[PDB]
Chain A
Amino acid sequence: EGGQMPIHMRLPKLKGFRNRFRTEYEIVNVGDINRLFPQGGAVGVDDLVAKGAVRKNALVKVLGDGKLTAKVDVSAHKFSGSARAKITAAGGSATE
Chain B
Amino acid sequence: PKAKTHSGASKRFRRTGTGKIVRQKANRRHLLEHKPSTRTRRLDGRTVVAANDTKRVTSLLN
Contact = CB atoms under 8 A, between A and B. Distances in A.
Contact of A12 (B9, B26, B53, B57): B26
Contacts of B41: none
B56 A15 contact: no
B24 interface: yes
Interface residues of B, number: 17
Interface string B29-62: 1000000000000000000000001001100100
B24 to A, nearest CB: 5
Contacts of B11: 13-14
Contacts of B53: 7
Given A8-B60, A12-B26, A13-B11, 10 more contacts: A7-B56, A7-B57, A8-B8, A8-B12, A8-B57, A12-B12, A12-B28, A13-B12, A14-B14, A14-B23
20 contacts: A7-B53, A7-B56, A7-B57, A8-B6, A8-B9, A8-B60, A11-B12, A11-B23, A11-B24, A11-B26, A12-B12, A12-B24, A12-B25, A12-B26, A12-B28, A12-B29, A13-B12, A14-B11, A14-B13, A14-B24
